[PDB]
Swiss-Prot record:
Residues 174-286 form the Fe2OG dioxygenase domain. One of its GO terms (molecular function) is isopenicillin-N synthase activity. It comes from Emericella nidulans (strain FGSC A4 / ATCC 38163 / CBS 112.46 / NRRL 194 / M139). GO terms for biological process: penicillin biosynthetic process. It catalyses: N-[(5S)-5-amino-5-carboxypentanoyl]-L-cysteinyl-D-valine + O2 = isopenicillin N + 2 H2O. Changing residue 96 to E: Strongly reduced the catalytic activity. This is Isopenicillin N synthase. N-[(5S)-5-amino-5-carboxypentanoyl]-L-cysteinyl-D-valine binds at residues 85, 89, 181, 187, 212, 214, 279. Binds 1 Fe(2+) ion per subunit. It comes from the Eukaryota. Its cofactor is Fe(2+).
């Protein structure tokens, strides 16, 4: 009974080049999608997503229970007090199906000034043994920078869309300090599938992850070709079609704050599907002290009655809030 969400495919390739009129024509498409359902597929993005999926599969399918405890975040292993964000998020057979691996900026090394300062939301990544997962760390770090590049080009499009210069958001999205994360999520096939890992929405839809707005500026997501996402619109929840050749893009609640909800963070959820699949989000986060002054593109003077919020404050509060709402993943 559910209708299909309008999720246009936008060729973002001009955002990598110097043809300004072409970039404006992409910016208009990003504006139309952001003001309608809030989602689009970025195509011609240049990233080898089949190899991303193959390397991710090799990792998820070969990592062992011992390795998962050794990489686990603090929620699963009290010995790893410094790992709030980065590391392994374990499944609980019989109870919780999903499991994942999160990593942050590869530049957050032991000598990074924010690591030295023990500033919240900055952590040094943890990695499996190289001999057990040859090439994985290097692949994953290079992927961070490939999707960082895509994200910077998308942020030039969002800036132009909002009537700003193209570096409006990108000047706060920097390799040396971005709080952006990759999450490599495995949604397993299980027979029988644990009922405790299946939630039910108020409308009866079986879910794996409840309604939410993202904690990000924008979210840049690769998924397998198994339909599962829905977006809430004025006409109710609608199905987002899968496309394992594109990146699904949406805004998160920092973009809604900065634009006075002109570009809403769309509410969306994940249906339960008993299928072996991948969900590989990149959360485009700024630096800890990044503050963009809020504005309102719908007002002639561009003024908004919102207070500036630093990205670090936003991110640390939003990540806790999302766990309290929808559970520890
Ligand atoms: C379509 S919702 C995005 C994809 C994925 N969901 C998620 O990734 C959920 C909701 S956006 N996000 C989260 O749980 C936030 C993870 C933050 C990360 N540990 C970090 O530290 O930066 C899924 O369930 O498939
Ligand atoms: Fe989300």
């Amino acid at each position: 009974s559910v209708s299909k969400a309008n999720v246009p495919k936008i060729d973002v390739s001009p955002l990598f080049g110097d043809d300004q009129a072409a970039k404006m024509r992409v910016a208009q498409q990003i504006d139309a999608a952001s003001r309608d359902t809030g989602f689009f597929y970025a195509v011609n993005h240049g990233i080898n997503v089949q190899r991303l999926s193959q390397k991710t599969k090799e990792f998820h399918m070969s990592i062992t229970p011992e390795e998962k405890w050794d990489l686990a975040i603090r929620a699963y292993n009290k010995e790893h007090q410094d790992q709030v964000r980065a590391g392994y998020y374990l499944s609980i057979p019989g109870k919780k199906a999903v499991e994942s691996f999160c990593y942050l900026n590869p530049n957050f090394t032991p000598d990074h000034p924010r690591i030295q300062a023990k500033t919240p939301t900055h952590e040094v990544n943890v990695w499996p043994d190289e001999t057990k997962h040859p090439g994985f760390q290097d692949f994953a770090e290079q992927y961070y920078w490939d999707v960082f590049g895509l994200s910077s080009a998308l942020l030039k499009g969002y800036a132009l869309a909002l009537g700003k210069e193209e570096n409006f958001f990108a000047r706060h999205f920097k390799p040396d300090d971005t709080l952006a994360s990759v999450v490599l999520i495995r949604y397993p096939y299980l027979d029988p599938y644990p009922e405790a890992a299946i939630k039910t929405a108020a409308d009866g839809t079986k879910l794996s992850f409840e309604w939410h707005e993202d904690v990000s500026l924008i979210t840049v997501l690769y998924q397998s070709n198994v339909q599962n996402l829905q977006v809430e619109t004025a006409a109710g929840y609608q199905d987002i079609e899968a496309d394992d050749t594109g990146y699904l893009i949406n805004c998160g609640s920092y973009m809604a704050h900065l634009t006075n909800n002109y570009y809403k963070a769309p509410i969306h959820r994940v249906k339960w599907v008993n299928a072996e699949r991948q969900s590989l989000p990149f959360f485009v986060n700024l630096g800890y002290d990044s503050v963009i002054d809020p504005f309102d593109p719908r007002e002639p003077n561009g003024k908004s009655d919102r207070e500036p919020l630093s990205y670090g404050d936003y991110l640390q509060n939003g990540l806790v809030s999302l766990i309290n709402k929808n559970g520890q993943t």
